[PDB]
Design a protein around this nucleic acid. Structure first.
Lengths: 59, 132, 812, 43
RNA sequence: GAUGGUAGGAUAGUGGCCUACCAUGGUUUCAACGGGUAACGGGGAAUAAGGGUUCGAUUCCGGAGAGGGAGCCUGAGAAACG
RNA sequence: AUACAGUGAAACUGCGAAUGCUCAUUAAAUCAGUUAUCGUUUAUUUGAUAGUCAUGGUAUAACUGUGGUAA
């Protein structure tokens, strides 16, 4: 799963590839505009706060 | 009519025989077994609500005509040490094969057999409640 | 500049396509795209009959071009309009792209290429070569074929240059982290030792640095260069016409292995034993499903009435129904009828339906759990189909122990229906992938004769030196991998790459002591252990799942190791060499090349808080760890199709840190199991449940704890929960006049609060009586199910029931 | 155009140059005498 | 709605154009109406034939279509059919 | 030229893009002529024509960068 995460004050947009099932299934069942933490996904994302903005499907 | 129903290449079909008391329902079910293993695809699953006369229901193999010989405990297929006169080998035996040489039974409380079944032969399903 | 070409290139391609074999080329260089289609045209002009299609596999990019014909035509038209070309110009490469037949395929979509046959395949991305992928494509390339790898990377360029300049030395830069493609290095070296491979550059200046540097052109001008399988094709064949209704289908049958396997099935048809399976172990694609089609053809032409098909999943029933020879009726369609026209696939859990059925075929038995296997090996007739030498399933020894716990003759299919036997690429592939598992059958140790555990030794392996392609190290590697495959039940081909290149993974060998003469002969292992360091030391598995199941920031900060594999043999399973190795490894933790074999002493481990083993739950290994020293930690709920068993993890800690949060987890997990009975493993064996609960009892009644013990319940809370009329009816059924439903209303929470240690100490009933209580109140199953579980055909069940509830009544 | 150039190759004698870069078979089954031919065909 | 009235909607605008409310009409042997018309027809429409016997050259044909019925959209002007 | 003024691609905006071939035949229909519009519409042309904050807020495109998909 690839994630484009941007931080707009620095203009820093970086993509990440994730290889599991669990962290992405944690992000499952959401709509755009909501919020999900970073502790349920990343040991290096503790205290991070990420807002959905969009996406692209597999096709 | 029922062999026409068998020759119908459908998956689902219901063949029903509502008979009065004393007309040879066991003869009809055994004839259904012989027909739909002789020309049917694979084999049939037989369900009764009780340990009924499935032994004679398979014994109607080539006999069961004008003289049927339904006997309590003297009958020759009911006797364990027997030669059922229609034995099987690498022979053309099919209509004399789809019967007492392959006595098999299904308890009606194990309904997964008849939930994934292909052809079944049912003695006395009127007593069976509607969802089952 | 019409330059010459070295004889090696067209010589190899012609010789391959007249020997029905496959060749392989690797191109280093700046382009390789322009040098590809010369090869393709060359291969057709070597032979005009062979297949045309070329498969192109890539990870995510395409080298300087794109596939969509509208896009390419629009670009090139607009290039004419912008005036950069001539109207009728197309280079050789783009000609090849828009003229040939290509199937493009990703890496991750590697499973849509199974049944097809391709004339050529192209592998674009070299630094992502999954073994499973490479097995896919190489197996599916048809004979008289080319496999070509493109190698645009200066990284691999420097790698191969360094390896050629020095086989022993290598080139490893830590700009990647701690991940290095040792599997790819082994790939490159074994390819160097291939007998019909070639390394070549752009403009085809063949490099003599590796490969079959000196092939000679055969004189293929002959009709007798013909294999013995061709030579003893059917020559006494009863192909005559007065009557030949199955002789037609035997003539349709292709190889001699197919032919006499069909002879095996017809001999089985003649054979009238009842409890019987006809076993085919096959290589993959070698005529297994073709034999299935001829088997169903013969067994509806002459067999009983028809057959039930059983498969763990809908695999290529595509080809199983595509075997044809017009819809079925009583007309001359018989030899075409005994095929597709009875589409009724069933689920292999209908074993009683199967017991009734005339004949049943089972396909890929390796994905069927053993109880289902026996329930289909009832007293009737079955055709067993399985793949030996094979991914995604069983092994040779696993299938033999299967038939031995079972039970009759077996037949093995080998001759490839596509390409020529004794194939160099096929053999080299089997060697590199290491699936030639016959090391169990070798005459030195075909028997179980092994020494005693009084002296056995652990050895840590310098896996870099192991995977360095040096023939004795290589030899040791197939020995240990044969052990590995025999040890597991089912295996994946990428796992070899996994422990070769995964940084945190380690391997150990329990070995007999060194031969005191010189130590020149080969060491021969007794057991092999695969672990991986996991935790805050960093492996995505254990602290994640613990954190999910319970919030434990302490556990997130913790670091330990997970055991993935215990590696012994059923020949050595007599006594417990693994237990020896377990005790040894736990003692080690808590107490011009680098060498091929490193002693355990000269490598200090890190600080390991905990050790945890992850495994599919079974009675034998559960009993084994339970006799060993691991805490039952977690059991899943949904048994997958493949293993048929819920996954389960053990832990163990014994250091100066007295943990006891493991004991807290043990109490929680026993409580959780008490909850989860009659939910998902509603139907599994009570003695297994008993083993699990007493192992948990051991774990939470381990040492070093005093507040983890249970406190006695209160009669106040007793009367809080119960009702005096329920107590009255308890005494009434104690007087034995009421109904067991009227006691089963209140049985389960009696079991619940009983199975606390307060009642465990108050009244001790840990026998078959407790088994019956567990079954009836917490497994919540029928008294009849308990009766046939205990195999006691009378009311002994109610005898022990009356005894134990009587004991409860005098408690009350 | 096999003998001529195409793509960028032309094939010599060997050295490819590249650029810069039942009654039917019963009757006709001839090891049978006609006597048993008609005998079998009658049966 | 055939003829007309009265009222209203609609339209840029009158007007049965359309609806209510009504009156019961209109055309006609001066042949209405209807039929055929080869109606590629005719128009001094068109420059003419600066002397061919009537003939040339131009212009209007008239409408519809832009896979096929149906519906919508802008612009001063489209029922645009790229 | 330390605001720019030369030149200029991408784009905003204004206007035009309502001056193409094939198929079907009507005698107050069409067409030609002649009205009327104290009964209508008009971008454009030209002609007139309005006493009733030393300056308010926005946004984009483009650009930058990160990506998806065979497209």
């Amino acid at each position: 799963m690839k994630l484009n995460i941007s931080y707009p004050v620095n203009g820093s947009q970086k993509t990440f590839e994730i290889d599991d099932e669990h962290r992405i299934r944690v992000f499952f069942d959401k709509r755009i505009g909501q919020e999900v933490d970073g502790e349920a996904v990343g040991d290096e994302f503790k205290g991070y706060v990420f807002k959905i903005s969009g996406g692209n499907d597999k096709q | 009519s029922f062999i026409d129903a068998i020759s119908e290449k459908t998956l689902n079909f219901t063949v029903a025989l509502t008979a009065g008391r004393g007309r040879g329902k066991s003869a009809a079910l055994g004839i259904s077994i012989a027909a739909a293993v002789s020309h049917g695809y694979s084999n049939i699953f037989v369900t009764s609500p009780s340990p009924e006369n499935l032994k004679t229901l398979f014994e109607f193999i080539f006999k069961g005509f004008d003289a049927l010989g339904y006997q309590e405990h003297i009958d020759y297929d009911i006797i364990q040490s027997t030669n059922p006169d229609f034995n099987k080998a690498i022979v053309r035996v099919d209509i004399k094969r789809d019967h007492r040489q392959t006595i098999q039974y299904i308890v009606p409380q194990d309904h997964q057999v008849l939930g994934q079944a292909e052809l079944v032969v049912i003695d006395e399903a009127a007593a069976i409640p509607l969802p089952i | 500049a019409k330059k010459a070409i070295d004889s090696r290139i067209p010589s190899l391609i012609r010789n391959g396509v007249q020997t029905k074999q496959r060749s392989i080329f690797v191109i280093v260089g700046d382009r390789a795209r322009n040098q590809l289609p010369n090869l393709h045209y060359l291969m057709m002009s070597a032979d005009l009959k062979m297949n045309k299609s070329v498969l192109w596999a890539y990870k995510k990019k395409l080298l300087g071009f794109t596939s969509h014909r509208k896009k390419r035509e629009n670009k090139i038209k607009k290039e004419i309009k912008r005036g950069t070309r001539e109207v009728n110009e197309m280079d050789p490469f783009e000609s090849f792209i828009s003229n040939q037949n290509i199937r493009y395929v990703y890496y991750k979509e590697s499973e849509k290429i199974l049944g097809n046959t391709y004339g050529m395949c192209i592998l674009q991305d070299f630094e992502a070569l999954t073994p499973n992928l490479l097995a896919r494509t190489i197996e599916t390339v048809e004979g008289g074929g080319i496999v070509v790898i493109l190698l645009k990377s200066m990284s691999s360029l420097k790698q191969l240059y360094t390896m050629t300049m020095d086989v022993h030395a290598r080139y490893r830069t830590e700009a990647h982290g701690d991940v290095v493609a040792r599997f790819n290095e082994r790939f490159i070296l074994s390819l160097g030792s291939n007998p019909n491979c070639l390394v070549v550059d752009d403009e085809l200046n063949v490099l003599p640095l590796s490969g079959a540097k000196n092939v000679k052109p055969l004189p293929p001008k002959e009709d007798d260069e013909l294999p013995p399988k061709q030579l003893e094709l059917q020559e006494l064949k009863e192909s005559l016409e007065d009557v030949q209704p199955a002789g037609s289908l035997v003539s349709l049958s292709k190889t001699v292995n197919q032919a006499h396997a069909i002879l095996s099935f017809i001999d089985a048809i003649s054979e009238k034993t009842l409890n019987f399976t006809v076993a085919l172990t096959a290589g993959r694609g070698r005529g297994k499903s073709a034999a299935l089609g001829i088997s169903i053809a013969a067994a509806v032409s002459h067999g009983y009435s028809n057959i039930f098909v059983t498969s763990p999943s809908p695999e290529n029933l595509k080809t199983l129904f595509e075997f044809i020879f017009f819809n079925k009726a009583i007309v001359r369609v018989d030899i075409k009828r005994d095929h597709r026209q009875t589409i009724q696939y069933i689920v292999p859990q209908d074993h009683q339906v199967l017991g009734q059925a005339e004949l049943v075929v089972i396909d890929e038995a390796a994905a069927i759990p053993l109880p289902i296997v026996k329930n289909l090996l009832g007293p009737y007739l079955v055709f067993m189909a399985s793949t030996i030498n094979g991914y995604e399933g069983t092994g040779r020894s696993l299938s033999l122990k299967l038939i031995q716990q079972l039970r009759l003759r077996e037949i093995s299919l080998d001759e490839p229906i596509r390409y020529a036997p004794g194939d160099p690429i096929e053999k080299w592939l089997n060697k590199l992938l290491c699936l030639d598992v016959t090391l169990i059958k070798n005459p030195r140790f075909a028997t179980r004769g092994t020494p005693h555990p009084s002296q056995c030794n652990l050895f840590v392996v310098n896996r870099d030196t192991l995977f360095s392609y040096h023939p004795v190290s290589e030899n040791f590697l197939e020995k240990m991998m044969a052990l590995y495959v025999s040890s597991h039940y089912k295996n994946s081909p990428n796992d070899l790459q996994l422990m070769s290149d995964a940084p945190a993974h380690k391997l150990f060998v329990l070995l007999p002591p060194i031969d005191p003469k010189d130590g020149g002969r080969i060491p021969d292992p007794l057991c092999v252990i695969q672990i991986a360091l996991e935790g805050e030391i960093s492996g995505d598995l254990i602290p994640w799942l613990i954190s999910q199941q319970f919030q434990d920031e302490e556990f997130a900060s913790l670091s330990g190791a997970r055991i993935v594999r215990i590696a012994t043999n059923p020949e050595y399973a007599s006594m417990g060499y693994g237990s020896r190795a377990i005790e040894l490894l736990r003692d080690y933790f808590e107490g011009t090349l680098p060498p091929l074999l490193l002693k355990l002493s000269e490598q200090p481990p890190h600080y390991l808080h905990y050790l945890g083993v992850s495994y599919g739950l079974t009675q034998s290994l559960h009993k084994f760890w339970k006799n060993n020293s691991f805490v039952p930690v977690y059991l899943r709920q949904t048994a997958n199709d493949l293993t048929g068993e819920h996954t389960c993890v053990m832990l163990n800690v014994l250091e100066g840190r007295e943990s006891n949060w493991l004991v807290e987890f043990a109490k929680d997990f026993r409580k959780r199991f008490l909850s989860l009975l009659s939910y998902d493993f509603h139907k599994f064996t009570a003695v297994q449940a008993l083993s699990v609960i007493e192992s948990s009892k051991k774990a939470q009644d381990l040492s070093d704890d005093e507040k983890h013990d249970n406190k006695e319940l209160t009669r106040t809370h007793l009367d809080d929960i119960f009702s005096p009329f329920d107590l009255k009816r308890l005494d009434s059924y104690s007087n034995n006049l009421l109904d067991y439903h009227v006691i089963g209303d209140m049985i389960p929470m009696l079991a619940l609060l009983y199975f606390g240690d307060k009642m465990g100490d108050s009244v001790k009933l840990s026998s078959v009586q407790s088994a019956i209580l567990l079954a009836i109140g917490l497994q919540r199953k029928n008294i009849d199910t308990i009766a046939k579980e205990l195999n006691l055909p009378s009311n002994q069940t109610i005898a022990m029931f009356a005894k134990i509830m009587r004991k409860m009544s005098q408690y009350f | 155009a096999p003998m001529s150039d195409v793509g960028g190759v032309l094939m010599d004698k060997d050295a490819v140059y590249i650029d810069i870069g039942n009654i039917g078979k019963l009757i006709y089954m001839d090891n049978i005498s006609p006597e048993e031919c008609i005998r079998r065909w009658r049966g």
